[PDB]
């Protein structure tokens, strides 16, 4: 199936004293593999997956150098944005950046991303063609003119279509034992009586990887969304994911209801009944 590599970066200004709190994380699909935290003692990019530990001290030097440079870019940005938005030196603000690439089942380039937010709102994003920018407001428009003049999009396109895809392929091969393994959801159904006339059926999906999954309910073979509750997919903490979907039913009519599970690790979707 499809694969991705993504890096996420957050800086939060500290107006009273010093530099922003900066946290950077890198992922392959739904597996974190690197991190940097400005509050941590090491001041190095650190491994978070066994397969990246195969990389030499040169990799760790280069990645630490880039990530510390990124922290400085965010520090300068927080200052520039305070100016663009006529804000006081007294409040804490946040800058967030995410970039990366998507590849299909053939591991060939599918899509590239490079986007920025200020205080949780869109600021500037590279468009899908990797040639132009979406600037949300006039402050971001001044950034867009600066980046067009310096041909920033061309540099990003080369990394996104090239380097990003090339290194994603490397990690997929190196971490094949886990990265290329799909973990099908372990499913079961629970039943909870609310009164003598109402019951809740809860369909569980546990221990799956990747995180993408669909859980749906049917009544007599027809889709049922009314009287259903679906929780957000959540991490188990061991690298896998969990989700549940519940339906409220009249007591005694449990047999009409079926839960349907779709996941990459299941050749055909699963059906569960009470």
């Amino acid at each position: 199936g499809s694969h991705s590599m993504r890096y996420f970066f957050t800086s939060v200004s500290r107006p009273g004293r010093g530099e922003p709190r900066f946290i950077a994380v890198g992922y392959v699909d739904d597996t974190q593999f690197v991190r940097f935290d400005s509050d941590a003692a090491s001041q190095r990019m650190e491994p978070r997956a066994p397969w990246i530990e195969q990389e030499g001290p040169e990799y760790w030097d280069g990645e630490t150098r880039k990530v510390k440079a990124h922290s400085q870019t965010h520090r300068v940005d927080l200052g520039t944005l305070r100016g663009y938005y006529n804000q006081s030196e007294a409040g804490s603000h946040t800058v967030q950046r995410m970039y990366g690439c998507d590849v299909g089942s053939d591991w060939r380039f599918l899509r590239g991303y490079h986007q920025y937010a200020y205080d949780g709102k869109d600021y500037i994003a590279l468009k899908e063609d990797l040639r132009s920018w979406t600037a949300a407001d006039m402050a971001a428009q001044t950034t867009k003119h600066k980046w067009e003049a310096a041909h920033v999009a061309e540099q990003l396109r080369a990394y996104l279509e090239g380097t990003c895809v090339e290194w994603l392929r490397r990690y997929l091969e190196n971490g094949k034992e886990t990265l290329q393994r799909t973990d099908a959801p372990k499913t079961h159904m629970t039943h909870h009586a609310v009164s003598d006339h109402e019951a809740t059926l809860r369909c569980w999906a546990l221990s799956f990887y990747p995180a993408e999954i669909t859980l749906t309910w049917q009544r007599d073979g027809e889709d049922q969304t009314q009287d259903t509750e679906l929780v957000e997919t959540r991490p188990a903490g061991d690298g896998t994911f969990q989700k549940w979907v519940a339906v409220v039913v009249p007591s005694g009519q449990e047999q009409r209801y079926t839960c349907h599970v779709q996941h990459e690790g299941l050749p055909k979707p699963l059906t569960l009944r009470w």
Binding site: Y7, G26, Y59, E63, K66, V67, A69, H70, T73, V76, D77, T80, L81, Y99, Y116, Y123, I124, T143, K146, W147, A150, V152, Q155, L156, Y159, T163, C164, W167
Partner: peptide, 9 residues
């Protein structure tokens, strides 16, 4: 592997 060069806003 991260992007080799950065750019400020």
């Amino acid at each position: 592997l991260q992007l080799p060069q950065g750019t400020t806003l």
